[PDB]
């Protein structure tokens, strides 16, 4: 994972349960106490799970719950980094430009291998959405749909219709309705 992403991860982790827990949880896999996180630096994905798996430990929380509440944060700080995104958009057009999104955020990149967001319409206030990836990261995912409600401030309830892995890639399809019509007629 790009160290943009990590290392704002461990500043939602320091954010939300303290410097003492962290420090401790990066010490734990090598990490020097004065690391910068330079941009295009590439953080190995099984070391994050390790960080993760530790602040676990010293937090009694489950590391899923973790993982859905660093999601729920990190829709904000996006909007810091690409407003063009957020600017004059509703929820669902956000929602279904984020396949695109990936791709176009990634391309650059030799080997990117950024996870598939396809959406789709199924009736006047809902849409599929199905996960797509080799990092298995779904809790993320789901944390990520609830930040974009959030932060467009417009409800949806989120039910999760299939989960499950195919050869490496994991998949999870989810239907999101929106307690208001999003679509026209
Ligand atoms: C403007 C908002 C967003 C931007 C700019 C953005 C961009 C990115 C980028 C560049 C990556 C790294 C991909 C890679 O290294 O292969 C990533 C990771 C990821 N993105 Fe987003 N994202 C945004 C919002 C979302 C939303 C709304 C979702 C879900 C609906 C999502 C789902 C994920 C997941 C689950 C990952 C982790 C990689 C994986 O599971 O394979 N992102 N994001």
Do not use: C
């Not at 010293?58 to 407003?83: D, L």
């Not at 958009?89 to 279904?96: G, Q």
């Not at 890639?169 to 309705?177: D, E, P, T």
């Amino acid at each position: 994972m790009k160290g943009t992403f990590v290392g704002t991860w461990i500043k939602t982790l320091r954010d939300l349960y303290g410097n003492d827990v962290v420090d401790e949880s990066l010490k734990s896999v090598g990490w020097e106490p004065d690391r910068v996180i330079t941009p295009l630096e590439d953080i190995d994905d099984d070391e994050v799970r390790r960080i993760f798996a530790k602040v676990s430990e010293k937090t009694g929380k489950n590391v899923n719950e973790i993982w859905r509440e660093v999601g729920r944060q990190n829709i904000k700080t996006f909007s810091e980094w690409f407003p063009s995104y957020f600017a004059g958009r509703r929820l669902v057009n956000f929602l279904m430009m984020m396949d695109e999104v990936h791709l176009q955020l990634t391309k650059m990149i030799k080997g990117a291998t950024p996870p598939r967001l396809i959406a789709k319409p199924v009736a006047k206030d809902a849409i599929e959405m199905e996960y797509v990836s080799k990092r298995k990261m779904y809790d993320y995912f789901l944390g990520l749909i609830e930040g974009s409600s959030k932060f467009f401030k417009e409800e949806i309830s989120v039910e999760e219709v299939e989960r499950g892995e195919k050869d490496g890639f994991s998949r999870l399809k989810v239907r999101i309705k929106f307690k208001n019509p999003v679509f026209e007629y």
